[PDB]
């Protein structure tokens, strides 16, 4: 699918929410990974508008409470995932042409995401 473009612009969005939340709540942001296919890129063209494959909001003592990973450029069955550790939550945001970025069928928007984050924060984080 042509989903590729549409996912990536959404991925920037997703990050954006995380940065605000980080300064807002008094919890840090931490880049985890960068795309292999950017480091080891070596003459290739480029499409991805950021370089961050995984990133997280941490309690402040280095344990994460919220993980966020996009699928890398090449691989099939692309998705964006979220996960709360220690509480087995594995969320699969897909993109659907004709809706937006959806968790299955429910639209993911900022309010949604922020609420999810605070329920995460409150259970798992000690900060």
């Amino acid at each position: 699918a042509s989903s590729e473009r549409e996912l990536y612009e959404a991925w920037v969005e997703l990050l954006s929410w995380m940065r605000e939340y980080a300064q807002a709540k008094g919890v840090r942001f931490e880049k985890e990974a960068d795309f292999p296919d950017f480091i080891y890129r070596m003459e290739r063209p480029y499409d991805l508008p950021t370089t961050i494959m995984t990133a997280s909001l941490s309690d402040g003592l280095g344990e994460p409470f919220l993980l966020a990973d996009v699928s890398p450029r090449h691989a099939k069955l692309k998705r964006i995932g979220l996960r709360l550790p220690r509480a087995h939550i594995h969320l699969h945001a897909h993109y659907e042409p004709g809706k937006g970025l959806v968790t299955g069928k429910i639209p993911l928007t900022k309010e949604r995401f922020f609420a999810l984050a605070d329920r995460a924060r409150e259970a798992l984080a000690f900060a």
Partner: protein, 178 residues
């Protein structure tokens, strides 16, 4: 806690040898789970402290299963069957309706604080597929479009799940197709 509940502890510590202490983790965890509707870290520090092993051990044991919730849950923790038998009778479509009615993802709680949704694998009530179990109180056997919408609309109105009326029957141990 279990500070003022020392008979319950005494009961479960009596069931097992004095060196089989780690056994106590299964019942004790499940007690905390029911009474507050979830287990928060501090609880796990107590369970640990009691049973004579480090927190980290108990964290590992606790996190193994799939009943427990380590985030807040609604009043009616909906544990929807979604394994083969149930799938084949259309558990899929139930799960669409339920989730889109309540409006929440998993790990989220309905704005009321009455409804969490959650998948689970088989419950062993295949004859009466699809089926859901609401907390530790017996299975809402069958779920016809009516029975679902009835269950919800009733539950929002504060009844129990056995006092909300439900069309049809669902068998004792053999059933007949409606």
């Amino acid at each position: 806690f279990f500070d003022d509940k020392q008979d319950f502890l005494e009961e479960t510590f009596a069931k097992y040898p004095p060196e089989g202490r780690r056994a106590a983790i299964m019942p004790l965890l499940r007690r905390v789970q029911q009474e507050e509707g979830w287990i928060r870290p501090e609880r796990i520090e107590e369970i640990a402290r009691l049973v004579g092993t480090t927190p980290t051990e108990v964290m590992g044991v606790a996190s193994f299963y799939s009943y427990y919730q380590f985030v807040p849950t609604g009043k009616y923790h909906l544990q929807v069957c979604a394994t083969l038998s149930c799938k084949l009778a259309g558990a899929e479509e139930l799960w669409d309706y339920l989730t889109e009615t309540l409006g929440i993802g998993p790990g989220e709680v309905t704005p009321d604080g009455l409804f969490s949704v959650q998948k689970v694998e088989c419950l062993g009530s295949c004859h009466t597929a699809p089926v859901i179990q609401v907390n530790d109180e017996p299975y809402v056997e069958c779920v016809t479009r009516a029975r679902l919408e009835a269950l919800l609309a009733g539950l929002r109105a504060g009844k129990r799940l056995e006092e909300i009326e439900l069309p049809g029957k669902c068998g004792h141990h053999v059933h007949e197709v409606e």
